[PDB]
Ligand SMILES: CCCCCCCCCC(=O)O[C@@H]1[C@@H](C)[C@@]2(O)[C@@H](C=C(CO)C[C@@]3(O)C(=O)C(C)=C[C@@H]23)[C@@H]2C(C)(C)[C@]12OC(=O)CCCCCCCCC
């Protein structure tokens with residue numbers, strides 16, 4: 001059945017490369033973006049250690 | 050006096066103009082309620098015309114017009130005459146006097162006999178989203194309470210004449226406490242007096258008829274004045290109902306947030322769950338704020354005082370424990386369903402001599418699959434006696450469609466079973482409600498990628514159709530041969546646009562069409578197609594995703610609270626009722642013993658508070 | 665608010681019924697259909713571009729633009745885009761089918 | 764855009780649309796109640812109003 | 813700031829290079845189409861208006 005195999009392979013290339021990657025990058029872009037205040041305080045805690 | 054005469058007489062407010070017209074009424078047997086001097090458009094009579102055109106608060110024509118109508122006989126027909134217009138329908142003269150904020154003439158129309166339960170069922174008197182201007186009530190008692198009149202709302206209850214009780218539902222079921230919610234925007238000037246008259250008409254109803262909770266009276270949608278503030282988005286009157294302590298000994302059953310013990314700075318407080326949380330026995334405020342809330346301040350209404358801990362309490366009582374069960378019993382059931390596709394030995398017309406326990410391990414695999422197929426079906430059956438409720442229904446049917454084709458030996462069994470296996474792992478992606486990071490990106494791409502990729506789709510389709518049809522027109526016709534790298538063919542519409550964006554992204558090597566009319570203009574238009582398109586259109590989308598990630602970062606906390614709320618209520622509404630009554634969050638507190646003593650069987654909730662300022 | 669100089673106004677009160685007040689503005693020169701000069705043409709075209717976006721959104725000038733969009737603006741613009749798009753597709757065909 | 768389309772109309776069509784209404788404002792020196800083209804804006808006020 | 817003057821100028825480049833590709837097609841020269849290729853893309857750049 002190449003009629004349905006090409007359908008599911010399109011859902012693979014859409015969801016993995018386009019969707020799930022852009023889900024992850026946009027997640028990185030706002031969660032660990034503003035760690036300028038956080039990682040400064042953790043290093044000072046690490047430097048004191 | 051004709052018809053436009055007398056309406057112009059009372060309009061200026063000049064008295065002594067008719068001055069003995071009462072014989073002329075009795076002469077030709079003319080009466081004020083007759084259609085002669087009534088305006089044919091609306092239906093306005095003498096007394097409404099005076100009240101709209103009032104001068105400095107008083108109209109001296111009205112005690113004349115009351116006395117003239119007294120002698121003619123029509124007073125019950127004259128005071129109570131609805132505007133039969135479809136734009137003011139039902140509006141008596143009582144509605145006008147309460148409108149224009151004059152206590153004086155309200156006292157006269159009550160004394161001469163009003164129709165104080167008058168339903169102004171006009172198109173003017175509709176909700177704002179229903180083609181109307183000012184909703185209120187549809188009743189004269191509700192006009193005094195919605196338009197901020199404390200003195201008139203007192204007078205309409207304790208009158209010597211016909212009493213307007215606070216219980217009467219209108220044409221759509223709304224009582225006055227439904228009406229105070231319906232005119233309450235959640236601003237500051239609004240929710241100042243709205244919380245006052247919600248109190249002043251609740252306390253008055255208990256010092257009246259003491260066996261009826263007025264708030265318990267439902268409108269004709271089943272909602273209550275708390276659930277009507279829940280569904281229509283209000284927060285000003287919503288906070289007030291939950292935190293409503295009343296210290297009077299007669300009105301103590303009308304109290305939520307009971308005060309409790311206090312050992313120094315460990316002040317306790319005891320909130321009620323009369324409508325906030327039932328175990329399926331009744332409607333719920335918590336179900337309304339999470340599922341169907343006319344999508345308004347859900348992040349502000351799921352925070353108030355007790356709703357914030359009632360979801361924290363259900364989570365670590367049954368919620369978190371049943372959630373990890375709901376993950377691994379679903380994720381293992383997919384792996385069981387996965388291996389029944391990889392190691393499936395039938396490929397159509399099933400192998401009747403199975404005869405192997407390894408085949409019998411796999412044979413139990415479809416039994417688990419058929420169990421999940423029939424149970425996801427039966428959960429969806431008992432719903433319908435909705436986005437994701439239908440996707441589990443798709444996964445339920447396609448198992449059953451496969452299981453019929455399995456026993457029939459139809460070769461299309463293996464084709465349909467993969468359509469379940471693509472869809473089932475998409476619902477494993479749905480079980481992220483509580484893992485903060487994964488649940489964050491789930492509804493990112495819903496609004497951010499149906500729009501921006503579509504917004505990217507316009508500017509690329511505007512460009513490409515322009516450039517490619519320009520550049521295939523730049524090519525030569527077949528005059529010498531049917532080869533695309535030399536001439537234009539029927540597939541030139543296809544193979545150019547395939548080769549068009551390929552040359553941009555990764556095929557930067559030569560790939561040049563030699564046989565053209567003017568090669569000096571082809572290379573220039575190709576250079577513009579590199580930079581005036583996709584390269585610049587990439588830098589747009591980086592600036593799009595650069596700025597629209599700041600919008601989802603603003604909603605970071607506010608989408609996780611609603612995912613976590615839908616997590617708990619889906620677990621809770623799937624349980625049987627005796628199991629939910631086993632898990633009644635809070636405790637059965639005896640708190641009051643009011644008349645017909647039989648003390649308060651009221652399922653309350655503890656919230657402790659640490660304060661040194663009050664101390 | 666007085667009697668002799670009431671005609672020197674541009675926001676007249678029209679009707680009121682509790683908190684649903686209705687005021688009635690004037691379009692003496694805020695919108696003229698070509699018989700005069702008009703402020704709404706001067707605001708969009710012949711204006712100093714510093715506060716132009718802050719003078720459109722005061723009172724009716726904000727609402728009068730979305731009202732003309734509601735009457736003939738959205739209609740004749742949507743006719744305009746499809747007529748220009750069906751003009752360039754015709755000009756597309758005169759390019760490829762050019763013997 | 765909206766003012767660009769409206770210029771492209773002739774005056775005959777442009778007077779026929781005429782956003783607003785022809786109200787009777789209030790009595791003036793020359794008999795007539797100051798006939799002016801007008802536009803209505805409705806507003807809620809639960810305040811001191 | 814070219815808020816309306818951009819596309820008014822870009823409509824003028826289109827309105828010239830249709831006439832130029834017309835007149836070069838009118839008398840003798842086969843180089844009418846080289847200017848007309850510009851008239852295509854400017855005809856479709858101006859749909860971004
Ligand atoms: C003290 C705490 C313990 C309390 C007892 C535990 C609860 C028992 C009961 C239990 O676990 O029930 C869950 C329910 C809620 C659902 O998730 C079911 C699957 C769907 C789709 O219907 C998603 C839902 O969240 C949902 O939205 C609806 C409508 C029902 C639940 C699913 C079953 C009914 C089979 C289910 O079972 C699972 O294992 C969940 C995932 C589905 C896997 C199928 C498992 C069957 C064979 C492996």
Ligand SMILES: CCCCCCCCCC(=O)O[C@@H]1[C@@H](C)[C@@]2(O)[C@@H](C=C(CO)C[C@@]3(O)C(=O)C(C)=C[C@@H]23)[C@@H]2C(C)(C)[C@]12OC(=O)CCCCCCCCC
Nearest residue numbers: 736739740744747748749751764767768771772820823861
């Ligand atoms: C219910 C409403 C009643 C309607 C009555 C009549 C409505 C006419 C009203 C109408 O559609 O007039 C259009 C206007 C807006 C423009 O497009 C004119 C062309 C130029 C050139 O600079 C400018 C514009 O493109 C522009 O930027 C804006 C916003 C106005 C349009 C052009 C005319 C004023 C002649 C025009 O007419 C066309 O057909 C050109 C269209 C542009 C190319 C398309 C093909 C031309 C012929 C369709």
